[PDB]
Amino acid sequence: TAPDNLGKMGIQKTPQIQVYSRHPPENGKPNILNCYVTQFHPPHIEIQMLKNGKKIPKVEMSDMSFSKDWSFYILAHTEFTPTETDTYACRVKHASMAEPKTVYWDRDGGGSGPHSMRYFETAVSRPGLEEPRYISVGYVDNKEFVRFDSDAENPRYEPRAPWMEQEGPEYWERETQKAKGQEQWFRVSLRNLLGAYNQSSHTLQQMSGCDLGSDWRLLRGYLQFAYEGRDYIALNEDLKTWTAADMAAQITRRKWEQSGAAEHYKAYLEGECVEWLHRYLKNGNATLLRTDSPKAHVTHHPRSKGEVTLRCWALGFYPADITLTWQLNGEELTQDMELVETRPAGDGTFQKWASVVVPLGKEQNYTCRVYHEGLPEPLTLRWEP
Ligand SMILES: *[C@@H]1O[C@H](CO)[C@@H](O)[C@H](O)[C@H]1NC(C)=O
Numbered sequence: 275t276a277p278d279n280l281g282k283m284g285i286q287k288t289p290q291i292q293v294y295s296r297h298p299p300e301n302g303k304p305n306i307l308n309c310y311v312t313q314f315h316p317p318h319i320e321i322q323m324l325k326n327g328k329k330i331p332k333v334e335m336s337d338m339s340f341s342k343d344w345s346f347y348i349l350a351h352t353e354f355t356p357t358e359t360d361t362y363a364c365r366v367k368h369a370s371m372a373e374p375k376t377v378y379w380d381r382d383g384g385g386s387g388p389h390s391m392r393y394f395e396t397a398v399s400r401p402g403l404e405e406p407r408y409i410s411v412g413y414v415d416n417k418e419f420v421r422f423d424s425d426a427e428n429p430r431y432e433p434r435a436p437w438m439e440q441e442g443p444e445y446w447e448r449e450t451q452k453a454k455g456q457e458q459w460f461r462v463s464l465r466n467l468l469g470a471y472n473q474s475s476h477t478l479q480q481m482s483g484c485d486l487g488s489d490w491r492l493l494r495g496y497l498q499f500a501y502e503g504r505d506y507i508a509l510n511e512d513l514k515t516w517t518a519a520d521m522a523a524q525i526t527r528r529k530w531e532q533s534g535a536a537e538h539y540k541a542y543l544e545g546e547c548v549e550w551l552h553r554y555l556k557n558g559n560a561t562l563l564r565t566d567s568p569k570a571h572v573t574h575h576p577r578s579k580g581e582v583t584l585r586c587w588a589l590g591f592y593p594a595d596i597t598l599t600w601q602l603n604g605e606e607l608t609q610d611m612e613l614v615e616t617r618p619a620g621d622g623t624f625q626k627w628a629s630v631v632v633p634l635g636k637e638q639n640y641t642c643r644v645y646h647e648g649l650p651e652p653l654t655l656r657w658e659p
């Protein structure tokens with residue numbers, strides 16, 4: 275259930291690109307190629323996937339999520355069957371870069387833990403058009419489940435997970451009406467903010483949600499806003515007081531203090547947010563509460579006559595929480611270890627790898643350990659000659 279805002283309001287980051295396959299690539303066998311682009315702002319971006327320099331058709335996109343620091347995520351993926359000589363790339367156009375960036379494919383909560391709900395709301399003012407584009411994405415445990423997009427010919431909240439088909443029409447009508455309210459709220463706020471910062475594209479973001487534990491009781495609630503991808507105002511953990519990021523947001527804070535806005539959101543986070551997440555978790559039991567254990571292996575990458583890189587892979591796991599660690603004769607090497615952010619592999623599962631540089635001839639004294647709730651015991655494995 276989406277939040278409902280009350281009183282209104284009173285820079286570029288270059289993307290990071292990762293290109294990888296869902297399964298270990300075998301020539302002539304079906305697979306999925308992923309292009310995972312993160313940490314960029316503004317959200318507008320153009321992504322193409324290439325095979326031998328040719329645009330690949332029917333590329334799917336997971337759109338319009340963002341992280342705690344307000345920078346945007348996107349996942350582009352397409353099924354493909356690789357062969358030995360083909361070359362594959364991902365080409366990204368973003369306003370933070372002078373020219374397009376091409377990255378080539380190198381062939382070398384959830385479950386039983388805590389749970390959370392989030393609504394990621396973004397309005398972007400467009401120069402050639404009147405109204406801003408307003409998008410709302412709802413998430414349960416890293417899984418998109420609802421979406422509203424004002425660029426739709428008939429804008430409406432739509433189900434994005436199969437267990438939301440269960441909700442009757444009055445649910446969708448009620449959520450959609452909230453979205454239209456939010457759209458007006460964001461539109462007038464964008465106009466106020468343009469004056470407040472004395473400006474002449476612009477972005478306004480909201481993130482709201484509740485965190486639950488394993489007992490499914492409220493751990494913490496959030497309600498935070500950003501302008502131009504930078505903190506503006508956030509509701510503190512007490513759900514009573516506000517933290518303002520600059521002098522403009524201080525004016526908004528005192529206005530929202532006079533009007534008791536914090537209590538309106540406190541009631542949503544403590545009651546509605548918690549109770550309907552419970553229902554979503556139970557309706558989506560088979561999907562959200564499953565555990566898929568990781569399959570793990572170690573690869574060998576010589577770099578000179580004296581040194582080699584060992585990379586510990588974990589594939590096909592759900593939920594996303596996982597711990598990869600390297601050890602040398604029993605003691606852990608976390609400080610001198612190279613990791614990659616846990617990444618989605620395009621089918622509901624996730625991937626991660628961790629690497630160390632070791633002297634050639636001592637590979638057998640290094641061990642990788644994998645911790646995952648889907649594993650009855652932690653996995654221990656080492657490079658196999
Ligand atoms: C999920 O479904 C199974 C089978 O229907 C049931 O036994 C289990 O208790 C359910 N889990 C939760 C958390 O509702």
Ligand SMILES: *[C@@H]1O[C@H](CO)[C@@H](O)[C@H](O)[C@H]1NC(C)=O
Pocket residue numbers: 603638639
């Ligand atoms: C390293 O590996 C070898 C091979 O098993 C072993 O003999 C040795 O005790 C291990 N540990 C150290 C500290 O050398």
